[PDB]
Every structure is written in structure tokens, then in C-alpha cells.
Design an enzyme around this catalytic site. Structure first.
Site, PDB file in Angstrom:
ATOM      1  N   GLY A  62       0.870  -1.166   0.000  1.00 26.95           N
ATOM      2  CA  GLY A  62       0.000   0.000   0.000  1.00 26.95           C
ATOM      3  C   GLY A  62       0.908   1.216   0.000  1.00 26.95           C
ATOM      4  O   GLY A  62       0.646   2.218   0.656  1.00 26.95           O
ATOM      5  N   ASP A 132       0.245   0.198   4.737  1.00 30.25           N
ATOM      6  CA  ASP A 132      -0.520   1.429   4.676  1.00 30.25           C
ATOM      7  C   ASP A 132      -1.704   1.235   3.721  1.00 30.25           C
ATOM      8  O   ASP A 132      -2.109   2.156   3.021  1.00 30.25           O
ATOM      9  CB  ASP A 132       0.367   2.581   4.206  1.00 30.25           C
ATOM     10  CG  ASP A 132      -0.313   3.933   4.348  1.00 30.25           C
ATOM     11  OD1 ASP A 132      -0.262   4.536   5.443  1.00 30.25           O
ATOM     12  OD2 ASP A 132      -0.919   4.395   3.357  1.00 30.25           O
ATOM     13  N   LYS A 166      -0.829   0.860   9.838  1.00 32.50           N
ATOM     14  CA  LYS A 166      -1.733   1.958  10.146  1.00 32.50           C
ATOM     15  C   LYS A 166      -2.600   1.498  11.290  1.00 32.50           C
ATOM     16  O   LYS A 166      -2.916   0.318  11.406  1.00 32.50           O
ATOM     17  CB  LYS A 166      -2.654   2.279   8.976  1.00 32.50           C
ATOM     18  CG  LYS A 166      -1.984   2.850   7.755  1.00 32.50           C
ATOM     19  CD  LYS A 166      -3.005   3.022   6.621  1.00 32.50           C
ATOM     20  CE  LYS A 166      -3.953   4.189   6.862  1.00 32.50           C
ATOM     21  NZ  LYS A 166      -3.329   5.506   6.543  1.00 32.50           N
ATOM     22  N   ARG A 168      -5.939   3.293  13.236  1.00 27.74           N
ATOM     23  CA  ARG A 168      -6.868   4.369  13.562  1.00 27.74           C
ATOM     24  C   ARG A 168      -8.075   3.607  14.087  1.00 27.74           C
ATOM     25  O   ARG A 168      -8.746   2.892  13.346  1.00 27.74           O
ATOM     26  CB  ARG A 168      -7.237   5.174  12.324  1.00 27.74           C
ATOM     27  CG  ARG A 168      -7.780   6.532  12.639  1.00 27.74           C
ATOM     28  CD  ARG A 168      -9.041   6.776  11.855  1.00 27.74           C
ATOM     29  NE  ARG A 168     -10.163   6.085  12.468  1.00 27.74           N
ATOM     30  CZ  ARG A 168     -11.367   6.003  11.930  1.00 27.74           C
ATOM     31  NH1 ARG A 168     -11.608   6.566  10.754  1.00 27.74           N
ATOM     32  NH2 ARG A 168     -12.330   5.370  12.578  1.00 27.74           N
ATOM     33  N   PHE A 171     -14.580   4.454  14.983  1.00 28.03           N
ATOM     34  CA  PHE A 171     -15.275   5.378  15.858  1.00 28.03           C
ATOM     35  C   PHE A 171     -16.284   4.670  16.744  1.00 28.03           C
ATOM     36  O   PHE A 171     -17.080   3.862  16.272  1.00 28.03           O
ATOM     37  CB  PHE A 171     -15.956   6.466  15.030  1.00 28.03           C
ATOM     38  CG  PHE A 171     -14.997   7.432  14.415  1.00 28.03           C
ATOM     39  CD1 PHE A 171     -14.240   8.274  15.218  1.00 28.03           C
ATOM     40  CD2 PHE A 171     -14.816   7.469  13.037  1.00 28.03           C
ATOM     41  CE1 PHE A 171     -13.311   9.136  14.657  1.00 28.03           C
ATOM     42  CE2 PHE A 171     -13.889   8.329  12.465  1.00 28.03           C
ATOM     43  CZ  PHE A 171     -13.131   9.165  13.275  1.00 28.03           C
ATOM     44  N   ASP A 173     -19.113   5.540  17.997  1.00 23.83           N
ATOM     45  CA  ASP A 173     -20.459   5.645  17.444  1.00 23.83           C
ATOM     46  C   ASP A 173     -20.677   4.793  16.199  1.00 23.83           C
ATOM     47  O   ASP A 173     -21.810   4.539  15.818  1.00 23.83           O
ATOM     48  CB  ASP A 173     -20.884   7.129  17.192  1.00 23.83           C
ATOM     49  CG  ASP A 173     -19.891   7.950  16.319  1.00 23.83           C
ATOM     50  OD1 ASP A 173     -18.769   8.274  16.794  1.00 23.83           O
ATOM     51  OD2 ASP A 173     -20.255   8.311  15.163  1.00 23.83           O
TER      52      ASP A 173
END
Lengths: 288, 445
Positions: A62, A132, A166, A168, A171, A173
Site C-alpha cells: 500500500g 498502509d 496503520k 486508527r 469510531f 459511534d
């Protein structure tokens, strides 16, 4: 006014002392090249420092266009370090990467089949993976799972001695299910989007002993909280006690990264080298 | 535009669309090579054959053809891959030969009973023609390049005790890849020998050249410029040698490796020569008091047979109480990361491990087998080996080392050969054997 007198920047996610509630109400040309080049120099310099980068192959999944990689390629070459670079991405790369004997460029999409194929090819040289993968807007929580999923496979097939992926967190929610990700330190990133939670999961393996850590939604909340702090309150301060041309937090954060980078050249002080490096990096990327 | 010609004035033919694409990026390196006077070059390999290679059975036409012949094998070679491999090797000549090989033409006896004493204290275990024709070439290198080449091994003590026989020159260089290439191009044009530059994986930054028959000619270890400084050096015949004090410290960490013991098994006298030449240097150099009486040295090296981590007590010498010595470097590097540690002190080959004093605790990695006296009892030499290691760090960071050494030395005088009950097993080092082979145009890493 809104200045600060820090002792050192937050290098890893674990090191964040406060936190704030994600308030939905929330630069330099070529930042998303700086964010990457500064993280990969840190990582691969860290490796080299613990002698793992020595004569190993750095596989990248990536990595397009990965302009910055040319720089990395050159920094290390000049340092005498011998490395095989293998870049694989579904798309094509920046031509500056063509013609390098030490750099192979695959242009195809990866999967089980393929990962098992290159490991056979590369063995027995140790492998250093740099993932990535991507899935504009925001990737879906479903894509994050599908992505982090794949990255863990690269780890099993390739059985890399060290990796950088990576990370992250989805979320809260927008939670779906839980999952596991390699054990590693979550490296915070300089010159990263104003409100990004994305970090770098640097991890060093022990082969016969793999380790994963279950990510949950409770966890996902402490991610959004602490990160939103780092972004809203932390990276907006001015390190008054940082003797350097630029005092914006990131410059102070990028300082601490490069100080850990090796250069065969000689400099009077570290400030002398960091300022040199920066001066070079910002040059290659073409940042005034 | 000129790339078109550059590539054509290089291949001895017209560049194919396929080739013009690939090579295109080397339009500058191929040009800088063409535009490179490929003659004065023939003038230099010759102005060497007669300076370090007299005894060479070959006309000055071979050491002239071999050259030009390589410099234009882009014509014979049409393979895109072998080109890239012949283009990066030709370039090593066009830019470094001058600064590298070009420049090339412009007591202990009174301690023999001591090394004798000690070696036996531990006694408990159980190559081409050019090899010599070359050492001569290197003696010069050490002079002409003070800061891009440091020496050690047997030959180092030779500049100390002109009685320390040498049949090889071990060195450290901040450029040994550029170095080794040029010399392999030298041993070629002159001899006509097809040397092979091989890189050993389980060795930190290591490349050695060998002959057609697989015989070791010369090797080399590489170090950052960084490291090239903190490495304690001693100036002699215009050449810097790895200070004999440091070299000797690193020899205790030596005998901790079962092998070396087995080496000294079948020749307990082998190191008397080298080892005394050294106990004789320190005794003087840093007035070392040599008396069987000198306790507090073999430090409490409690070993945890599970986590493979010898726990050394240094509290009676340094501000940092203990120093968790690891046996698995892949682990240490990981735990260290967890500590959020970003500046562990690495000195590469020199120490074969990094050092981190995180909170009064020093973490490190032992690169040899841990010898035992009994079941989970870290044998005496290993206790001294470990200790010796820690002291290498001091010498590289200019800290407290003097006295400890003394205590360490004395601990080895007049002792009872404690047998080798058992030992630990080195951690496996990853990697593949890499290598460059000029003849077949092969570069792999």
C-alpha cells in the site's frame, strides 16, 4: 497566552496524560508526505539501531505513489546500510523509484495466495513490513476492519521480524465488532491531519511468540478522547522552551524523532543535525 | 535527448524502447562513466601491480584488457538486469577508486607466566596465495586512511609486540562496501581471479571477499561514523588500532563462548602470546596492580533459565544498580520499545548489542552462550564475560571502567578450573547469505 514549557513531546499514544470529548465541530504543502517520511525514518532508524534493519528486505504493501520512499531509500544507502526494497501496491509508483537495483516494484493487488508466494521468494532473508493499505471522505468502520484484518494476514504469511502498520481505531459511534491487532507501540504522527486519530503501530516480533491485543469499544472511546485532546489542545501550543527555529508543537515533535536518526556527516550539536535533516527532508518534499 | 545518446554511447548499440525506459534514470551515471577516462584508469591498476603486486604472472596487456573489457560489456550484455548490475559496479570505480585505492601510490615475555596462569585457569572445554600478497596492500590503507579504517585482531598487537605473528588484517571501516568492491576489482584486473564478495547474515554489518576456490582473502566490519568516534583508538605507525585495553576487555567476553574454550582446549598456549601481549599493555599503560588478591569482581550474575536473562549486579561499581543482560536480542529490542525508549546506545559490531540505562537499570544483550558451573549457576568465565561486556560500554561512553577492569583481571589469576557443567544456546540470527559476483553480473541481498 497559550504557550507551554514541555519536557518532551508525546511520542506514543500510551503517553497521553489527558483527554477531551470529541466535539464534531472540528497546512504546509506536502504534509501527507512529511507525515509518512518522518514516521518511516523513525521506524527504520529505530530498527537499524537494534540491528534488525541490517541487510534485510523492507516490503511495503500500500506504498503508492510513495514519493517519500525515494528519500528513505537514499538516506540509508548513503549510511552504508544494505537493504532490499520491495514495493507492492495495486497502483503505480512515482517514476523516481524506477531504475533502482535495490528497489523492486510490483504492481498488483495482494491476498493470501500472493503473500504465500513472495515469502517463498524472499526467504530466508528477514522481512520488515510497512503496511498502509487504503480503502474520499472517511473509510468505513467496515473497511477498517477489513483492512486491519488483512494486515494481520501479512504478519502470518510473511512472518516479519518487525512491522509498521496503520492504526486508527474505529469510531465508537460507528462500532461493529471487536478485533485483534498486533502487539506494538502506537506511534503518534507529526504533521498529520488536524483531527486524525490515525497513528502507527510499530511492533517487533519474537517469531515463535506472537501477541495480539483485543480492541474493544471501551478502548475505542479512550482513543477518540485522548486523540481529540492531543489534536485540539496539545498540537496547538507553542513550546517556549524549545530552542529551535520553529516552536509549533509538531516541529518540536518532529525534532524528537530525527534526533534518533543517524547521519554519517558530523554536526556541532544535535540541534545542528536535526535542523540539517529537516532542512533536507523539507527540501526533497519541496516544502518551503 | 542526450539520454538517448548517453545510453547508446554506453551499450555499443542503439537503445531499445524497453531499455531507454529503464536505464533512462541512469543517464547521468552512465554518462559520468562514458565521459570517464577509461585509460588513466589502466595507468593506475598498473601503477599498483608493480607496487603491491610484483609477483604477478600476467602481461601489462591483461591488466589493461580485463579493464577495458569490463568497462564495455554493456555491448555484449543485452539483459536489462545484468546491465543495472554492471552499471552500479562500474560507477564504484569512476567515483571512489581514487580516494580509496588510488591514494595508495602517493616486554610481553615478562607477562607470559601471567597469560599462562590465566588461560589455564579457564582451560576446561571439551587462505589463498593472495592472502599474504594482500596484507601488504592493506598496511598502506591503514596509513592513507586514518579516519575511514581502524584496525584490530592479531595484527594490531603486532604493532605492539613485533613478535605477535600476523597472517591477516582485521579492520573496521565507515565505507567497507565501497572499499571491498574496489579491492575485488583490483584482485581481478591484476590477477584475473574471479573473487566473490559474500555477506554473512548472523554478523552485524559484515562483507568478505573470497577467491574462485572459496578461500578467504580479506573481510571487513562496517560502522556508522557515529560509532567510528566513540571507539577507543590508539595511534601507532601512522595507523589507528583499536586500543589494546578495549581489545583485551573484549577477550574475556570471548571465552564465555563455549567454542573459544574448545579452541583454547587444543592449544592452551595459542592465546598466551596474544593475551600476555595485552595484560602487559594494560599493566603499564594504566598501571594495573596484578595480585591474586582482588575480590568484589565476579558480580552476582543470577541467571533466570526461563526468560533467558542473566541478572548482573554492578551496584558496587555504577550508579545503575543492576543490568538485565538478555540472551535474545529480538526480545530486548521489543521490550525496549515498550519502555518508549528511543535512544538506546548502539555500537554495532564492536559490542554486538545495544545498551539502555532506563531508570538506573541497564538493559543489554549477550551475544554468546552462557557457561554454567552447575544447574543454573553462571560459570565464572561467563560471569566475567558478561561483566567485561558492560565495561565495553563504559569505554565507548568514556565512563568509570579503570578499577573494575583491575578487579576483573585479578579474579582470573590462580583459580581452580571449574568444569563446563552446561551452557545456554545463542539466539538464531535471521537473514540470507547475500553476495556480489562480478563475473556472472550477480548482486543479491
Amino acid at each position: 497566552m497559550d504557550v507551554v514549557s514541555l519536557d518532551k513531546p508525546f511520542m506514543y499514544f500510551e503517553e497521553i496524560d489527558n483527554e477531551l470529548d470529541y466535539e464534531p465541530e472540528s497546512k504546509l504543502p506536502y504534509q501527507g508526505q512529511l507525515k509518512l517520511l518522518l514516521g518511516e525514518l523513525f521506524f527504520l532508524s529505530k530498527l537499524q539501531r537494534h540491528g534488525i534493519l541490517d541487510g534485510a528486505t523492507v516490503v511495503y504493501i500500500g506504498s503508492a505513489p510513495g514519493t517519500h520512499i525515494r528519500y528513505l531509500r537514499d538516506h540509508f544507502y548513503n549510511l552504508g546500510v544494505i537493504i532490499k526494497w520491495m514495493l507492492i501496491d495495486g497502483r503505480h509508483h512515482d517514476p523516481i523509484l524506477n531504475g533502482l537495483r535495490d528497489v523492486t516494484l510490483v504492481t498488483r493487488f495482494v491476498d493470501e495466495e500472493y503473500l504465500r508466494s513472495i515469502k517463498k521468494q524472499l526467504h530466508p532473508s528477514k522481512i520488515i513490513l510497512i503496511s498502509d493499505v487504503a480503502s474520499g471522505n472517511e473509510p468505513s468502520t467496515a473497511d477498517l476492519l477489513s483492512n486491519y484484518a488483512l494486515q494481520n494476514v501479512m504478519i502470518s504469511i510473511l512472518n516479519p521480524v518487525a512491522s509498521s502498520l496503520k492504526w486508527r481505531c474505529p469510531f465508537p459511534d460507528q462500532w461493529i465488532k471487536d478485533f485483534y491487532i498486533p502487539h506494538g507501540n502506537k506511534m503518534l504522527q507529526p504533521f498529520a491531519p488536524s483531527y486524525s486519530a490515525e497513528m502507527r503501530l510499530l511492533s517487533i516480533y519474537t517469531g515463535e511468540n506472537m501477541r495480539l491485543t483485543r480492541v474493544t469499544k471501551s478502548d475505542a472511546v479512550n482513543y477518540e478522547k485522548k486523540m481529540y485532546y492531543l489534536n485540539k489542545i496539545v498540537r496547538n501550543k507553542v513550546v517556549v522552551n524549545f530552542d529551535y527555529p520553529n516552536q509549533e508543537y509538531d516541529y518540536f515533535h518532529m525534532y524528537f524523532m530525527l534526533r534518533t536518526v543517524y547521519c554519517n556527516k558530523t554536526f556541532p550539536t544535535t540541534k545542528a543535525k536535526v535542523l540539517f535533516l529537516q532542512q533536507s527532508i523539507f527540501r526533497f518534499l519541496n516544502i518551503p | 535527448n542526450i539520454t538517448l545518446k548517453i545510453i547508446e554511447t554506453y551499450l555499443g548499440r542503439v537503445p531499445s524502447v524497453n531499455e531507454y525506459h529503464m536505464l533512462k534514470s541512469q543517464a547521468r551515471n552512465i554518462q559520468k562513466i562514458t565521459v570517464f577516462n577509461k585509460d588513466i584508469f589502466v595507468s593506475l591498476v598498473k601503477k599498483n601491480k608493480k607496487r603491491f603486486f610484483s609477483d604477478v604472472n600476467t602481461s601489462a596487456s591483461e591488466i589493461k584488457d580485463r579493464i577495458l573489457s569490463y568497462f564495455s560489456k554493456q555491448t555484449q550484455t543485452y539483459n536489462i538486469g545484468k546491465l543495472f548490475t554492471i552499471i552500479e559496479l562500474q560507477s564504484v570505480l569512476v567515483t571512489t577508486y581514487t580516494d580509496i585505492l588510488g591514494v595508495l601510490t602517493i616486554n610481553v615475555t615478562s607477562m607470559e607466566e601471567l597469560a599462562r596462569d590465566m588461560l589455564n585457569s579457564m582451560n576446561v572445554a571439551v587462505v589463498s596465495s593472495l592472502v599474504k600478497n594482500v596484507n601488504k596492500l592493506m598496511e598502506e590503507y591503514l596509513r592513507r586512511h586514518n579516519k575511514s579504517c581502524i584496525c584490530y585482531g592479531s595484527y594490531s598487537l603486532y604493532l605492539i609486540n613485533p613478535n605477535i605473528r600476523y597472517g591477516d588484517i582485521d579492520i573496521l571501516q565507515t565505507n567497507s562496501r565501497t572499499f571491498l568492491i574496489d579491492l575485488a576489482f583490483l584482485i581481478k584486473f591484476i590477477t584475473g581471479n574471479n573473487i566473490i564478495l559474500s555477506k554473512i547474515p548472523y554478523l552485524r554489518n559484515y562483507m568478505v571477499i573470497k577467491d574462485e576456490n572459496d578461500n578467504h582473502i580479506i573481510d571487513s566490519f562496517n560502522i556508522r561514523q557515529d560509532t567510528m568516534n566513540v571507539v577507543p583508538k590508539i595511534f601507532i605507525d601512522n595507523i589507528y588500532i583499536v586500543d589494546p585495553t578495549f581489545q583485551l576487555l573484549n577477550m574475556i567476553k570471548m571465552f564465555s563462548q563455549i567454542d573459544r574454550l574448545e579452541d583454547l582446549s587444543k592449544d592452551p598456549e595459542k592465546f598466551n602470546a596474544r593475551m600476555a601481549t595485552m595484560l602487559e599493555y594494560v599493566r603499564y599503560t594504566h598501571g594495573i596492580v596484578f595480585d591474586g588478591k582482588r575480590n568484589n569482581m565476579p558480580m552476582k550474575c543470577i541467571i533466570d533459565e526461563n526468560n533467558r536473562i542473566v541478572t548482573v549486579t554492578t551496584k558496587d561499581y555504577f550508579s545503575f544498580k543492576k543490568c538485565l543482560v538478555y540472551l535474545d536480542e529480538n526480545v530486548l529490542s521489543s521490550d525496549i520499545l515498550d519502555l518508549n525508549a528511543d535512544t538506546s546506545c548502539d555500537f554495532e559490531s564492536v559490542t554486538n548489542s545495544v545498551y539502555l540505562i532506563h531508570d538506573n537499570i541497564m538493559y543489554t544483550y549477550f551475544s554468546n552462550t552462557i557457561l554454567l558451573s552447575d544447574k543454573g549457576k553462571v560459570h565464572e568465565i561467563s560471569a566475567r564475560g558478561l561483566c567485561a561486556h558492560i565495561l565495553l560500554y563504559q569505554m565507548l561512553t568514556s565512563g568509570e571502567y579503570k578499577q573494575c577492569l583491575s578487579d576483573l583481571l585479578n579474579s582470573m589469576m590462580n583459580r581452580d578450573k571449574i568444569p563446563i557443567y552446561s551452557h545456554t544456546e545463542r539466539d538464531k540470527k535471521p537473514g540470507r547469505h547475500g553476495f556480489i559476483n562480478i563475473e556472472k553480473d550477480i548482486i543479491v541481498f
